Amino acid sequence: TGLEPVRRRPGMYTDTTRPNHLGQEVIDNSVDEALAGHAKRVDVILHADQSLEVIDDGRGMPVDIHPEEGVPAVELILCRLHAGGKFSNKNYQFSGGLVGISVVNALSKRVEVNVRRDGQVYNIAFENGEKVQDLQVVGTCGKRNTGTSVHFWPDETFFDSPRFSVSRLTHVLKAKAVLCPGVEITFKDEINNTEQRWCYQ
Numbered sequence: 255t256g257l258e259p260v261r262r263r264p265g266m267y268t269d270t271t272r273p274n275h276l277g278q279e280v281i282d283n284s285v286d287e288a289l290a291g292h293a294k295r296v297d298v299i300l301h302a303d304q305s306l307e308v309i310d311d312g313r314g315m316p317v318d319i320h321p322e323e324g325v326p327a328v329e330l331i332l333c334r335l336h337a338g339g340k341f342s343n344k345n346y347q348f349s350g351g352l353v354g355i356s357v358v359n360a361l362s363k364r365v366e367v368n369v370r371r372d373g374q375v376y377n378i379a380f381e382n383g384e385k386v387q388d389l390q391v392v393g394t395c396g397k398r399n400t401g402t403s404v405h406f407w408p409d410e411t412f413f414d415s416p417r418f419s420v421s422r423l424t425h426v427l428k429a430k431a432v433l434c435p436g437v438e439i440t441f442k443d444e445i446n447n448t449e450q451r452w453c454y455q
C-alpha cells in the first residue's frame with residue numbers, strides 16, 4: 255500500500271518519541287469541524303491499554319462512494335498519504351500546517367472509525383495500515399446524532415515509548431478550547447482515573 259514508506263521511516267512523518275502527535279492529528283481534524291461551526295463538543299479518551307479515542311459531534315467523516323475508485327470517502331482519507339505535511343534538511347525541519355489521519359493508520363496495530371450520519375452508525379476498521387473491515391452499518395441512532403469517533407492503538411515498535419504524555423496531551427486540548435471559543439473539549443484518563451473539561455467564553 256502507499257502507506258508503506260511511513261512504516262519504513264516513521265520519523266519522517268511523525269514524532270516517534272511517544273504517540274502524542276498521532277493523537278494531535280486526530281484532534282486537529284475534530285477541531286477543524288468545530289472551527290467551521292459543525293461540532294460543539296470534542297471528547298478525548300486515553301484508554302487503559304494506552305489507545306486513544308477522539309470523538310466529535312460534527313457532520314461525520316464523509317461516507318459517499320467516489321465513482322472513479324468505487325470506495326467510500328472515509329477509506330480514501332484513511333489510506334491516502336498526503337505529501338509535504340512534514341519535511342527536513344540538515345539545517346531545517348517543518349511540520350505540519352493546514353499531516354493526515356493516514357499516518358495514524360500506517361503506525362497503528364488497529365484503527366476503528368465510527369461515523370454517525372443520517373440516523374445510521376457506520377463502521378470501518380484497519381490493522382497495521384491495512385483494511386480489515388469494510389464500511390458497514392452496525393447500528394442506528396437519532397437523525398440529529400451525527401459525528402465521528404476515531405479509536406486507534408499505536409504500534410509500540412514505532413515509538414521510543416508507547417505511553418501518551420498526559421501533560422502534553424492536556425495542554426494541546428486546553429490550547430484547542432482557547433482557539434475555538436464555545437467548543438467544549440473533554441479528556442478522560444482511564445489510566446490516572448481523572449476527568450477534565452475546558453470551555454472558553
Ligand SMILES: Nc1nc(-n2ccnc2)c2nc(-c3cccnc3)sc2n1
Pocket residue numbers: 283284287310312313314315316331355402
Ligand atoms: N473529525 C472529522 N474529521 C474529518 N476529516 C476530514 C479529513 N480528515 C479528517 C472530517 N471531514 C468531514 C467532512 C468532510 C467533507 C464533507 N463533510 C464532512 S466531518 C469530519 N470530522
Ligand SMILES: [Mg+2]
Pocket residue numbers: 425429
Ligand atoms: Mg499553549
